[PDB]
Amino acid sequence: STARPRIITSKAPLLPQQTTPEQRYWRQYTSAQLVKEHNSVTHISFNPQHPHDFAVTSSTRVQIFSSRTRQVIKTFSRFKDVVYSASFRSDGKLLCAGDATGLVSVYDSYNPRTILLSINASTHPTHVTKFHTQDNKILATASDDRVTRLWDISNAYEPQLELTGATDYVRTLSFIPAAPHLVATGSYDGLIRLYDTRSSGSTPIYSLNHDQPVENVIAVSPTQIVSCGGNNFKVWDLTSNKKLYERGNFNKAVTCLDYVENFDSPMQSALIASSLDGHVKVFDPLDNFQVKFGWKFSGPVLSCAVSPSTAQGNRHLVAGLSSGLLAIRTKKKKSNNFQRMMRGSEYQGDQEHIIHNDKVRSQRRMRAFERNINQFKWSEALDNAFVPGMAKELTLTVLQELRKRGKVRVALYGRDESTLEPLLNWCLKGIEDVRSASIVADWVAVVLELYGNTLESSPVLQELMIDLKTKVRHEIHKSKEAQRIEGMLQLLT
Amino acid sequence: NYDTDFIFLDIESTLGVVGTSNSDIFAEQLHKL
Amino acid sequence: DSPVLQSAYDPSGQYLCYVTVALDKQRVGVQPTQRATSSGVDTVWNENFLYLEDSKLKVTCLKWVNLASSDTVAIILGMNNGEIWLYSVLANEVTYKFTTGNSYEIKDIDLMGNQLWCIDSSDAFYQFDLLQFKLLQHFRINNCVQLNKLTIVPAGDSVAQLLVASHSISLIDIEEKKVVMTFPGHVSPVSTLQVITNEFFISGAEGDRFLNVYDIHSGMTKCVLVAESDIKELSHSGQADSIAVTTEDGSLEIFVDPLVGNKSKKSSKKIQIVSKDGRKVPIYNAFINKDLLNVSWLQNATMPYFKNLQWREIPNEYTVEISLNWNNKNKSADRDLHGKDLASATNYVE
Amino acid sequence: KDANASHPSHSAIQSLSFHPSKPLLLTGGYDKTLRIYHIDGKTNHLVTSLHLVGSPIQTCTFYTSLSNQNQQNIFTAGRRRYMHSWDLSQTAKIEKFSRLYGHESTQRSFENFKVAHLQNSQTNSVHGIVLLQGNNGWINILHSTSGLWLMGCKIEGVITDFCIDYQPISR
Amino acid sequence: MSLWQLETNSQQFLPRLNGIIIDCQVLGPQGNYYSLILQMTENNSNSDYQFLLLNASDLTSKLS
Amino acid sequence: QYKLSVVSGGKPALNNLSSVTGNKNIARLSQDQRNYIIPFNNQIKVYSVETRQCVKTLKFANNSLLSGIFLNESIVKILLGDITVAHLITVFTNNGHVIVLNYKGKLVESPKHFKISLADEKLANVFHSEGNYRILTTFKNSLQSYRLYALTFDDAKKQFEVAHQAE
Amino acid sequence: LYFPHISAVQIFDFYKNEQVNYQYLTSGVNNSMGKVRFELNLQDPIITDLKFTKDGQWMITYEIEYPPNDLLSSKDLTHILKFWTKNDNETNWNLKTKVINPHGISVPITKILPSPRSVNNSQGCLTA
Amino acid sequence: AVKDALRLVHLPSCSVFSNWPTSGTPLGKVTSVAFSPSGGLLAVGNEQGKVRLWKLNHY
RNA sequence: UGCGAAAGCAGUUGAAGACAAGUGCUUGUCGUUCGUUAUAAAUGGCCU
């Protein structure tokens, strides 16, 4: 004897644009909160450490948002002029910020009152201030002076190294993982300049030509560096010093770019890229950087960020808009006498000789229509097909199963106009769909051949046929057209 | 068959192939018991 | 610690007789050591047992009657009642019972053909004849205050001298009915007193890791064999060729040429049994004939299991591995892994 | 010496049973384990064990067929709608009784049961029967081997306990 | 396969057998086993017999 | 170079008589009920029930006698033990040959072959209770008629004698 | 040895001369119920062809589903092709892909040929 | 229900034994009792999971 | 039923004997034969 097979749901051949495993993961960022800030939110950064709060730079203040609460918990308003960065150090204890006056302020993260170090990097604006990932003490600064000074926390009076050679504004700075000596900077020259801090420095070891003003440079992996500038982002390989891939799917000029890897998604690594067209799109580095998802916002996007790999809780996608709007999308993650009397349940037989298991795993509960078919209730199973709030696919199966069982007339004998209209109502809408058109044709044929006399004496049944004849006639036009476009489509080939 | 031999099936459902002492006495009695 | 109170191989080393307790009554059973018979018939478990109908009654001594010598295989059982039972394993009934006049328990027994010698707790010797089923003589030798062991020296076809032991060992002449010689024994009572060869008999005592090899004629300790742990059983091969002693800790030691620094010798090969999971299975008796060694252990509670190994080729330290039940998923022949009936056909699932 | 000293139990000993002939003791409990010990009075080592996943043991008992002495069996039951039988060492031959043949309404648990001997007079053959407690004064009697439902007994009020008595007739 | 209990006219079922039951028999001193012959009428070209020995205790195929 | 030889088995044997119902199965379960004997069209398989595997196979081709008899005749019944006289089986075929084979061992090349004397009768079935044996045979509206004989083995002549009982 | 029984495959071991499996490879009323009377006129899907790749890790099956009689769609047979996979240790074939009406509508697949090891390391096939 | 609630009653006198069990006898919450078919052994299980064994010397 | 593609193209579905019912006559049936390639319906639905 064998267990009863489960009724198999009907699955028509795949249509174009099916949902992909990558899409299903990214749709889960459903809850959307739209916050309004004073000015364009220029930069957004995530704390590398738990609880992974993210800081947003806007106008003359920096705000830290709690991950779980999704609300501001700290505010750094000491800055007089505009702010331009809020990056944390790797430890997450400190966050640095640049200013239009050119001063760089290092505050203790989560303690806005205390200022640890204040550096006057330059008289020009200091747009980029980023802590070195491998080394904690050294802090990098790039200013409109076009020199990207490398400061040391202990010695704040003179830069440790003062890289130069950029003929335009430098607004991008990146540290290559596994290469602490290497530093990457991209200027609006369209040139990405790489520097070696071990050597004397001040002259790039080599430059990579992007041909458009570079808005942000990110090192995805130790050997691959992705740079977004102009209307495209290009991925360069340092060992070969040539661009492996280039994607220009964006319309407006890409502005920000972030990379996350080894997170719980089906895609091992993701690359999110802002567009300045309202689009932030996801690319897969494992698949030649192909688009896998995208969002649309009200206006141009200036900053995008995603929760680090080890978020340890609900993940966050953050988008920054020039209008001052901040959009947050989140993927949420008896008595002792009685117990002593009943104390054996926890035991799993770890110390025993023979372990014997016969319990049959619980099968999912069967639906009403399946139970009726299993019990040979042909007419009742038909009724369960046409009930309010019944899935269209599930309605097609019970009709297909009954036909397959050879019970189409058997289900339709003891019926009148009162209980026939639900079937005709579905047929009126089911005829339109391609999947159910063939099944509707068979079932409608039988009821006519089986209830011709009742149709004459019932006016309500007639009207169902008049509109049905109108709809089937409309399908004839659609099917005939599809043959004509098919006919001419053969002419082209 | 992927070897050299060939298998063939008959309508009779037959698959043929075309191819290239005191101790000893006590030992016996103890087993009987 | 061990459910097997006493055990003894037959002289040929193919059959083991062991006594264990069922509820409050002792039962005597015989099991076959060999995995298969000479004819090739696979060996089977022997369910038959001899039950002692009295709770007080107990077996103190177990001795085999040599299979080749006598027509019927039989085992002689010394009892605490003061009588000796001749047991025939086939008929599974006590053929005849030798009774001493007194009621004192029999401490030890020994046999050479028709001769049968026993000692009571009162230190009185007795002589019996199997064919005649008669008590021949009984005597008490002075200065033999205790007698835990008796062994008869194998001289010719007759018994002319008996080796008996207490904390000290003695040699007695039957005709003179007097002690001939004395040997400095152990501090504890003597447990084993086997005679390895002529003018050489080994001796061991309860809770002792040392075996003294004495010369019957001269009287000087030729050697002292040392075990890692206490000694329970002893078996000698050939004529002092090899000696296997079952330790108390469940390991078996083999002494290779113990009769050839020189005073104290240690075991040369050590054998152990450990289950695949990791539990150690003690060895309670062993047998060693020429080059093969038979190891006996208990599985379940009292079922004896045996293995034959050629000790010559075994390394110095060798652990036999045995598959014992532990956390076994129970597979029924009529079910697959998932519990579906084998006859049942697999369903169609998209 | 304590029987369970060798291999302790992780729950209360819900039932005990000595083997009719062999020197074995059987234990069972809500730890879902059937432990058999060789009771000698001095060591009491464990012969074997059998863990039944998700099968609390409210009662267990040995059984030996009255005619075929070679037939040995162990029946165990709990607050479940099925009962286990263990014929008597690489594996264990365990069968599950879970069919009542139309009388499932009277029996929602096998936890209270006993095993007896019934002689089929018209053939003079003897076989075992498993007796169960029903919901409404009902006692359901099954065939020990085939598992068939043979007869049922009803009393008024709530059944609390029952026992079996034998009355000899002739040779 | 239907077991009719004639005392109360009830019945027990063993459905979804591999084929229609040509023959049925109780095999044992105590009815331990049931022997069945199955036909597999799907194959019209040949008659496909299968012998099924079921354990009466739990109605599982002891030998197919 | 090449050679042709049978390898596998065939369909299980059946009592192919329309009239008989409830006697279609010929396979028998041993007295100890530890193994099931099933006759095939070309062999006899002994399956051990506790392990669900074919412990023994008795091929007609290997034997000279069974090759001559079955290679048309078919087994009409199998009886545990030997009627003439612990693992013997007596096979009765439709024509009348009575063959005493052994399982759980090595098949003997000289089984105790016999032959019941039937006069235009096709043996249909045989059965016993305790030492007494009766054989049902078919003799010839398209309906077959049946005869019931009593079968005994005489030690003096070592032959099967059949005595008429019913029709 | 694989025998394409009607709507199922019987996997049989001729070295041991014993059946090893019986698997249902099609939809239909196969073991859901026991057909009786007019239901016995129904025809379950027929496995016309069954073939293996040279590697042996993929199974290709071709099926014909017969419509029930006395309907509008009582003369339009459905042709199905299925690709199954299993690891060697496993005993049940798992359906990986299903093509409904290959080659078009109501057009049979007369011949199936698995590819040689040279092309696609034996992971291809032709249908004619 | 309570600890040490075990009594042995002699028949046909129906007089409870006095010497055993005592205050020091370990029984706990007695939940299972068994008499051996022979040998006069008494096994008493308790809620703690301990099966304690006694021998009746009369048998 | 033959052939074929799946569509279809050609060709069949007879005679005797016996039985039951109704009134020698009529119909219906066949665990009866010869020859040719040659509606259903006993309230009766699948375990744990």
Swiss-Prot record, chain A:
GO terms for biological process: maturation of SSU-rRNA; maturation of SSU-rRNA from tricistronic rRNA transcript (SSU-rRNA, 5.8S rRNA, LSU-rRNA); positive regulation of transcription by RNA polymerase I; rRNA processing. One of its GO terms (cellular component) is nucleoplasm. It holds the Pfam family UTP15_C. InterPro entries: U3_snoRNA-assocProt_15_C (IPR018983), WD40/YVTN_repeat-like_dom_sf (IPR015943), WD40_repeat_CS (IPR019775), WD40_repeat_dom_sf (IPR036322), WD40_rpt (IPR001680). It comes from the Eukaryota. Gene3D superfamilies: YVTN repeat-like/Quinoprotein amine dehydrogenase. Its main location: nucleus. GO terms for molecular function: U3 snoRNA binding. It is found in: Nucleus, Nucleolus. Keywords: Nucleus, Repeat, Ribonucleoprotein, Ribosome biogenesis, rRNA processing, Transcription, WD repeat. WD repeats lie at residues 36-77, 78-117, 123-161, 165-205, 209-246, 249-293. Interacts with snoRNA U3. Interacts with MPP10. Component of the ribosomal small subunit (SSU) processome composed of at least 40 protein subunits and snoRNA U3. In the absence of snoRNA3, forms a complex with other t-UTPs. This complex can associate with pre-18S ribosomal RNAs. Involved in nucleolar processing of pre-18S ribosomal RNA. Required for optimal pre-ribosomal RNA transcription by RNA polymerase I together with a subset of U3 proteins required for transcription (t-UTPs). PANTHER family: U3 SMALL NUCLEOLAR RNA-ASSOCIATED PROTEIN 15 HOMOLOG (PTHR19924:SF26), UTP15 U3 SMALL NUCLEOLAR RNA-ASSOCIATED PROTEIN 15 FAMILY MEMBER (PTHR19924).
Swiss-Prot record, chain C:
It comes from Saccharomyces cerevisiae (strain ATCC 204508 / S288c). WD repeats lie at residues 13-53, 54-97, 185-224, 226-260. The lineage of its organism: Eukaryota, Fungi, Dikarya, Ascomycota, Saccharomycotina. The chain holds residues 2 to 358 of 643 of the full protein. Its main location: nucleus. Involved in nucleolar processing of pre-18S ribosomal RNA. Required for optimal pre-ribosomal RNA transcription by RNA polymerase I together with a subset of U3 proteins required for transcription (t-UTPs). This is U3 small nucleolar RNA-associated protein 5. It comes from the Eukaryota. Belongs to the UTP5 family. GO terms for biological process: maturation of SSU-rRNA; maturation of SSU-rRNA from tricistronic rRNA transcript (SSU-rRNA, 5.8S rRNA, LSU-rRNA); positive regulation of transcription by RNA polymerase I. GO terms for cellular component: nucleolus; nucleoplasm; rDNA heterochromatin; small-subunit processome; t-UTP complex. Keywords: Nucleus, Repeat, Ribonucleoprotein, Ribosome biogenesis, rRNA processing, Transcription, WD repeat. Present with 33100 molecules/cell in log phase SD medium. Interacts with snoRNA U3. Interacts with MPP10. Component of the ribosomal small subunit (SSU) processome composed of at least 40 protein subunits and snoRNA U3. In the absence of snoRNA3, forms a complex with other t-UTPs. This complex can associate with pre-18S ribosomal RNAs. It is found in: Nucleus, Nucleolus.
Swiss-Prot record, chain F:
Involved in nucleolar processing of pre-18S ribosomal RNA. Required for optimal pre-ribosomal RNA transcription by RNA polymerase I together with a subset of U3 proteins required for transcription (t-UTPs). It comes from Saccharomyces cerevisiae (strain ATCC 204508 / S288c) (Baker's yeast). The chain holds residues 9 to 192 of 896 of the full protein. Interacts with snoRNA U3. Interacts with MPP10. Component of the ribosomal small subunit (SSU) processome composed of at least 40 protein subunits and snoRNA U3. In the absence of snoRNA3, forms a complex with other t-UTPs. This complex can associate with pre-18S ribosomal RNAs. This is NET1-associated nuclear protein 1. The gene is NAN1. Present with 6560 molecules/cell in log phase SD medium. It is found in: Nucleus, Nucleolus.
Swiss-Prot record, chain H:
It comes from the Eukaryota. WD repeats lie at residues 25-58. It is found in: Nucleus, Nucleolus. Interacts with snoRNA U3. Interacts with MPP10, UTP21 and UTP25. Component of the ribosomal small subunit (SSU) processome composed of at least 40 protein subunits and snoRNA U3. Involved in nucleolar processing of pre-18S ribosomal RNA and ribosome assembly. Belongs to the WD repeat UTP18 family. Present with 9570 molecules/cell in log phase SD medium. This is U3 small nucleolar RNA-associated protein 18.
